[PDB]
Design a protein around this nucleic acid. Sequence first.
RNA 1: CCCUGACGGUAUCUAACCAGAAAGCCACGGCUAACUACGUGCCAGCAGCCGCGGUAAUACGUAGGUGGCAAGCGUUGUCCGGAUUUAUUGGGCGUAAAGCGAGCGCAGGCGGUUUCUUAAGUCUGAUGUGAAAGCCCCCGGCUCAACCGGGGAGGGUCAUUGG
RNA 2: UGAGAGUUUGAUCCUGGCUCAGGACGAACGCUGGCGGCGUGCCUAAUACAUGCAAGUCGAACGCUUCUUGGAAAGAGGAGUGGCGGACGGGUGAGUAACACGUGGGUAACCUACCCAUCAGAGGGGGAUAACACUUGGAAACAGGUGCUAAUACCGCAUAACAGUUUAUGCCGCAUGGCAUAAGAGUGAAAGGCGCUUUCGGGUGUCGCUGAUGGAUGGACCCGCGGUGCAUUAGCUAGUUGGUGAGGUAACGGCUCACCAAGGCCACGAUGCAUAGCCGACCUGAGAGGGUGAUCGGCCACACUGGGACUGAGACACGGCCCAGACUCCUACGGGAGGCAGCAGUAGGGAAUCUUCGGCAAUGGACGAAAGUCUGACCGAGC
Lengths: 89, 201, 82, 83
Amino acid sequence: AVKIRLKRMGSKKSPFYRIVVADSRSPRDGRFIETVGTYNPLKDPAEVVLKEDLVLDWLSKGAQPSDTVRNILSKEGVMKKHHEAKNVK
Amino acid sequence: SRYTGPSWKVSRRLGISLSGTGKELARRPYKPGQHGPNSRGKVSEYGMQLTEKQKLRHMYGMNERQFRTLFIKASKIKEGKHGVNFMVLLEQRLDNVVYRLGLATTRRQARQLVNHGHITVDGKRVDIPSYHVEVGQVIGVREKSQNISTIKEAVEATVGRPAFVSFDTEKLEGSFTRLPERDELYPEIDEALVVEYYNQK
Amino acid sequence: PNIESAIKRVRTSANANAKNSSQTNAMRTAIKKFEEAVAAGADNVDALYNEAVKAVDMAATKGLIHKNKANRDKIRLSKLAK
Amino acid sequence: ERNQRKVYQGRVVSDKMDKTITVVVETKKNHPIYGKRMKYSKKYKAHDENNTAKVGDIVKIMETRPLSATKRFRLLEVVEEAV
RNA sequence: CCCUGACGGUAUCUAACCAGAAAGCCACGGCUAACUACGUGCCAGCAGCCGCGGUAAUACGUAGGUGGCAAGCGUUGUCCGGAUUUAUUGGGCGUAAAGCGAGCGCAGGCGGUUUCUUAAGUCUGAUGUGAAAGCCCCCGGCUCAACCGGGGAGGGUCAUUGG
RNA sequence: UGAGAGUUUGAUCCUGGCUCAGGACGAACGCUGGCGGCGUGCCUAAUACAUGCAAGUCGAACGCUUCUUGGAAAGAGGAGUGGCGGACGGGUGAGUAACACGUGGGUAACCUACCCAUCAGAGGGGGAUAACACUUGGAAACAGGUGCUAAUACCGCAUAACAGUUUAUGCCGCAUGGCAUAAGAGUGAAAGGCGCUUUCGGGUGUCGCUGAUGGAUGGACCCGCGGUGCAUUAGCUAGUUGGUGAGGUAACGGCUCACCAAGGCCACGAUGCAUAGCCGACCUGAGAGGGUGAUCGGCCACACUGGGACUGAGACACGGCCCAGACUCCUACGGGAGGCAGCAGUAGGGAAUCUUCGGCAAUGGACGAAAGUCUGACCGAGC
């Protein structure tokens, strides 16, 4: 059950998140496999940076996003590309 | 803490004016206390390095932790010397900028003006006196309420305006043109005794 | 036990143990029943070889021996009779 | 098989056991505080299909998998025989 | 399109009023910056090491003054430095501490000149790896700073393969 | 980026010890205290633990039963059979001087639920049981007996070999051997639920079910080298070291057996005794070094003390079972119950270390088609 989920990295009331691919048994801030982009809930139009050439490779191997990761992966047009590669060939 | 004492005993103990040449050492140029006029024998070469350090620390009214951190920071430049870069970083603090510009007579008055929230850099207010003013930033006088008694009068009587300070007396904007030099800055005390004082800290 | 779900696991696993042991003993006696007839040199010797093979195979689909144990078993028996 | 195991070199030391020989591989390594180079030795056990090689031989061995409680190597070839 | 905040009427911003509520701890004979009075009389006491105290004590106890730091200041305990005082870097053995009373010798350590060869040590190139956070370098965000984020270097006595 | 000083003498130079001037800390205590921000807070007894909470969920797998609106459909409760989860997350450092850990490799000796892809199936039968109803013994915890009942619960019969194994062929590798193709022999599975079209339509969407192969992810085993004191600790081993075969395991192997032999390790420190979780890192130093392994991340070990297995993809199991032991508690004397090194909290030890708080709004986790339900992880507040 590989996942693609968020990981908290702020101070106390100014949170920040790294987008990371981890085994689902791991702790939220513990071990992971690799990091895939960044996400900032402040900064009114929220800031996303991500590689999007590893997201498409993990997605095709059975990794699965959480609910917020799917929202910010569709705002970037990554889910459409998965759609157009899988069920189109 | 900062300091509130008689501020003039301080100059009589360093042997330097500290207040824009306005004379605290006019009468009785000796030290305070009973044993003032009756001086005594020589002073070590520890007393000399301590006296130089205290001269510089009391010039700009700061505390010992902050003085030492500023000194440690100036040591990471490696472009020039280490006492020159120190005494130049010392000048770029928002209190000296208000003193040099001319909106205040003393440095204590300038400190209270920047503490009580009457000045602005680039339009935005800034309240804390240890701020680091960079080169080319017009610091202003809170165009909300610039009609105060003492600021007005202390803009008129310009005792000293330097060769690195720019200013216009209508909008009340000033800025540093570029960084100063030792010839332009107290070539009287030191920067080598102070560097040695921190070798064995 | 304290937790309600820990109390159910006790009876569930007790029942699983009961039937698991029953079926393992079934398999073991089938195999031994073949061995005691190949050590005698008796007529009706290929039929019980077949039956022992089938016994092992069925135990492997009931989650009782892994799958490699079954390959090992069928190999050993094959080298004894056929 | 594109991955490769480890081969070594040494002189045979014991040949009493049946099908097994001890080979000493020798090397020099330095001292951590002071500089100079000391010599260092460790013994290996290797497998012998027929109890061939004898003492003083200079052999090569290769890493296999557990063949007993202690032996992990096999005998590749004999390079130079003692007389 | 529509729908959800425990913190919490929290941070923050604007108006009026008032210098009014907000400074202490250690030291002052030499090391080591900062001295005069009075009390007491080898007593009462002080000390990190030198050492003070028996009638004019800058060394004890108070007062006035002065020095260092400051919402803290001193004291005890633990560790590294100063300590080249275990010395690879980086010490010594005539008299200061220190050549076994003398030989013979197994293992070990170190070895004259030179031609060809090898490549174990030695030197060097390329590839993999040495997590993240830390120290460090550049850049950026909280009114500044602590703090927070982005991109790098560094760290192996490491492995493989080619000179 | 390498600063020194006092102190042996009547005076000196050298040797030499002792002391001081710098840093830092999970610190304690004396005097004294205005605020905000970010962090930190049982180092001692791995001592004994009152009280509350820390793991459940699914009615779209299945039969029952109670209500609110004699036949009525919905909404809200109750226990039960069945699935999945409870091996994660959270705590502590007692044991351990060894493949435990770090770094570098190997497995042609290996396993892997949920997740992604591919190929092929999904046929036809049977016997029960809890609940429920009645009934016995019980101080209780709880046990039995009779009768009826359901399923994705359970069991046989069919069909499937792409799996393993053996034979021939071709190619190949670092011994054992590996890959691909052809045959031969014995054998092995499976389950429905909710919808759409519904002329009988007999079709179909979706989620589940069985067999085989890959990926991913997680685990297992073997090896080189590296990090502690004592020689006022020199001998240690008898499944011990090797071979033959047999059993056994996911798997190679003295892993365990029967037989055969007499080997193995040690001054390059075996054996024994004492102390210690290991590392990224942290403090100090000009460097080489020296001293620590608290907050945070990774690996390991333990769960009142000591043995064992069972269920399961995975445990020899942190709020599971069985036996023994010490301790505590309830009893009608026949007997029963328990384990804060989870979060708070208490008594005790100590120079010494916090509230018996709010919420799942955010991030992560379990189950469910989903709304959702659970979460002392965690996000906040208090000292």
